[PDB]
Amino acid sequence: APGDIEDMIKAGIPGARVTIRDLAGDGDHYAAEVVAEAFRGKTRVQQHQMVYNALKGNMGGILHALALQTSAPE
Numbered sequence: 505a506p507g508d509i510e511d512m513i514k515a516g517i518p519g520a521r522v523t524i525r526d527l528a529g530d531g532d533h534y535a536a537e538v539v540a541e542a543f544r545g546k547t548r549v550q551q552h553q554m555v556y557n558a559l560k561g562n563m564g565g566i567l568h569a570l571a572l573q574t575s576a577p578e
């Protein structure tokens with residue numbers, strides 16, 4: 505459902521700030537910015553892993569369907 509991606513990220517990574525946009529408005533492919541203190545000192549690969557974990561396999565094709573930008577809070 506709409507908002508479900510954002511909900512799962514925030515449930516799985518407590519304290520995360522999430523910005524989700526629906527690429528092409530197609531209800532299929534998305535881009536997400538996730539900012540979380542738990543990401544500080546982790547590599548981008550490590551941060552993305554935490555986001556994939558948060559989605560708990562609910563999003564088919566997530567490797568290509570959820571384009572990620574992650575960072576520690578500024």
Ligand SMILES: [Co+2]
Binds near residue numbers: 532533565568569
């Ligand atoms: Co696809």
